[PDB]
Amino acid sequence: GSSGSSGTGEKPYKCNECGKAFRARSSLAIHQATHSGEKPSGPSSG
Minimum Å gap between C-beta 4 and Zn ion is 16
Minimum Å gap between C-beta 16 and Zn ion is 8
| Cα–Cα distance list, 34 to 2, 5, 6 (Å) | 25, 25, 26
Point out which residues bind Zn ion (CB under 5 A): 15, 17-18, 20
Q: Which is nearer to Zn ion, 13 or 15 (CB)?
A: 15
Nearest CA to 29 out of 40, 17, 41 is that of: 17
Q: Which is nearer to Zn ion, 7 or 19 (CB)?
A: 19
